[PDB]
Amino acid sequence: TLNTIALQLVPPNSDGPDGGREQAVEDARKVLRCAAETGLAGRIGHVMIPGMIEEDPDRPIPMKPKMDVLDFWTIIRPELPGIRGLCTQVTAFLDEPALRRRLGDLSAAGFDGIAFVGVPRTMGHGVAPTDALSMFADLVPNRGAILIPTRDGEQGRFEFKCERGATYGMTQLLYSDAIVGFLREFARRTDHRPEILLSFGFVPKLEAKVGLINWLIQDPGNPAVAAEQEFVRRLAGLEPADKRKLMVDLYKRVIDGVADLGFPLSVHLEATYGVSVPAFETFAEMLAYWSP
């Protein structure tokens, strides 16, 4: 079990002559600075590096190439003394031998958890993500499945992934208490008690203009998600202290709602638009209420 506070850090664009290395160092230093400014120095235990970024097909200008997960960690690891690694990893291009090689490399580099994921919709000889969960379990021994508590059929989908060896579930961004009802029914139906990495994403006013979070959580026809998107739209437009209050209230509703269910809990902090002092001001008040 991780019992950790994880901060998501997206690898920089690698299309420059430095391959993103200067940007990676500055990003790490911005993390330390923002944590220090908000009373969170030394509190973040892990960085969550995604090894997959879904691309919105309707965005006019394309994503640039991104730094490899392990290249990125190698650069930022010296700048974040004491912080360890978590990641997601695409397994579609990793046969069983190559999956053991990648796992050994990530373990040796200091990664403690790995969530196996699929390929973006707009992009094949390896293991399916759910088959990888139980392989070479001594390497990076925290093995993550993605958990979206609003998604149709998620009770049977996530139960199966626990059967196949998931030790933790990394949630989609949480903008309602749907995870409370989900885990209450999961605990009732099953004996599985994976660690839950509860994901919380700061919403700046830029979301009102860009709508990236709204798109990241979209599920057309799902009324529970519609409610979440309405919550995100509301937050985007509220004044800074108002959106902090509402996000902290949501945090408290989730933590209280799941605290007696028997799942180990970690916290996954996300700033989709980039780390900032306002994001960390919100994180700090959340973690002041409850921290793993």
Numbering used by the authors: 2 to 124, 129 to 297
The authors write:
Methylene‐tetrahydropterin reductases catalyze the reduction of a methylene to a methyl group bound to a reduced pterin as C1 carrier in various one‐carbon (C1) metabolisms. F420‐dependent methylene‐tetrahydromethanopterin (methylene‐H4MPT) reductase (Mer) and the flavin‐independent methylene‐tetrahydrofolate (methylene‐H4F) reductase (Mfr) use a ternary complex mechanism for the direct transfer of a hydride from F420H2 and NAD(P)H to the respective methylene group, whereas FAD‐dependent methylene‐H4F reductase (MTHFR) uses FAD as prosthetic group and a ping–pong mechanism to catalyze the reduction of methylene‐H4F. Mutational analysis of four functional amino acids, which are similarly positioned in the three reductase structures, indicated despite the insignificant sequence identity, a common catalytic mechanism with a 5‐iminium cation of methylene‐tetrahydropterin as intermediate protonated by a shared glutamate. Based on mutational and kinetic analysis, evidence has been provided that all three methylene‐tetrahydropterin reductases have the same fold, similar methylene‐tetrahydropterin binding positions, and the same basic catalytic mechanism; however, the binding modes of the C1 carriers and reductants significantly deviate.
The flavin‐independent enzymes, named Mfr (Gehl et al., 2023), was currently identified only in mycobacteria as a monomeric enzyme. Recently, we reported the crystal structure of Mfr from Mycolicibacterium hassiacum (hMfr) and provided evidence that Glu9 in the active site is the key catalytic residue for 5‐iminium cation formation. Thus, the mechanism of eMTHFR and hMfr is basically identical. Position A contains a glutamate residue in all three reductases. In hMfr and jMer, apparent k cat of the equivalent Glu9Gln and Glu6Gln variants decreased from 594 to 1.3 min−1 (0.2%) (Gehl et al., 2023), and from 18,200 to 71 min−1 (0.4%), respectively. Neither variant showed a significant increase in the apparent K m for their respective C1 carrier, suggesting that glutamate and glutamine bind in a related manner. In addition, we obtained the crystal structures of the inactive variants jMer_E6Q, and hMfr_E9Q to exclude perturbations of the active sites. X‐ray structure analysis of the jMer_E6Q and hMfr_E9Q variants were performed and the structures were compared with the wild‐type enzyme, which confirmed unchanged active site architectures compared with the wild‐type enzymes.
